[PDB]
Amino acid sequence: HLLQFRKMIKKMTGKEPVVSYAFYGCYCGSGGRGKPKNATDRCCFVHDCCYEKVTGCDPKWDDYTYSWKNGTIVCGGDDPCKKEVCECDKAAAICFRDNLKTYKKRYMAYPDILCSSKSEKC
Amino acid sequence: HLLQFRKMIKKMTGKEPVVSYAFYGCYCGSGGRGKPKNATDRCCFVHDCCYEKVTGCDPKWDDYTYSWKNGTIVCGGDDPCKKEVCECDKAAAICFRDNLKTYKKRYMAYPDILCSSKSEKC
Numbered sequence A, B: 001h002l003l004q005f006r007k008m009i010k011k012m013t014g015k016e017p018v019v020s021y022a023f024y025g026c027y028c029g030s031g032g033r034g035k036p037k038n039a040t041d042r043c044c045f046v047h048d049c050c051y052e053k054v055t056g057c058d059p060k061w062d063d064y065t066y067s068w069k070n071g072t073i074v075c076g077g078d079d080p081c082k083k084e085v086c087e088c089d090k091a092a093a094i095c096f097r098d099n100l101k102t103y104k105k106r107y108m109a110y111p112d113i114l115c116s117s118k119s120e121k122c
């Protein structure tokens, strides 16, 4: 579920996801279009390519099970599809954390019309 | 250019594009995610797949040359890349016109979070 993804981001990043990430760049949030704006926008590009692989379940609205065991997200459960989407979310939050230093405030709330017409390939 | 696409739509459809089409369904406008909402949302889906083929120029911001010769859009010019994008625009406007009867007002201003997680393939 996206609300779980939201907690993973808030925890690792310290920022309120709905404000700082929901509308960043060209690939964060919605779907995505063009070429990733920056390091953080690429984290979203990948997260998008990830959700594209999940077949058996709904990565957006399906609740998965994970644990913050040891300051790290621990994806669990007996369902591999859900565990799959959980690993997608876990990787993105980590990605956001590692690139926090190159986060530009000018890209949050970024206009899509300004995004490339040639989208990058997963 | 998108401003030319805008005139083609207004003419064929009678509707102000910025209001009735710029935010329709899941694919209309810059972007697109999930599965096309309806017949009109699919016109946008295709228009998007069209712009994906244009390689040598900017379908969004490049001005092309066309003419309303005989109540029909007539794409011209010596540039094939530009003529290509013009044909994309011309096809969509026509598409909007042919499906005007199934246009649902509930889809204009449609929220993206509500769009499918599994995008359709061009």
Ligand SMILES: CCCCCCCCO[C@@H]1O[C@H](CO)[C@@H](O)[C@H](O)[C@H]1O
Binding pocket: A111, A112, A113, B002, B003, B005, B006, B017, B018, B021, B022, B023, B028, B029, B030, B031, B044
């Ligand atoms: C599909 C019909 C598009 C006709 C041209 C409309 C021009 C406005 O374009 C719109 O601008 C918005 C805000 O800048 C963006 O969020 C939309 O994605 C974009 O389509």
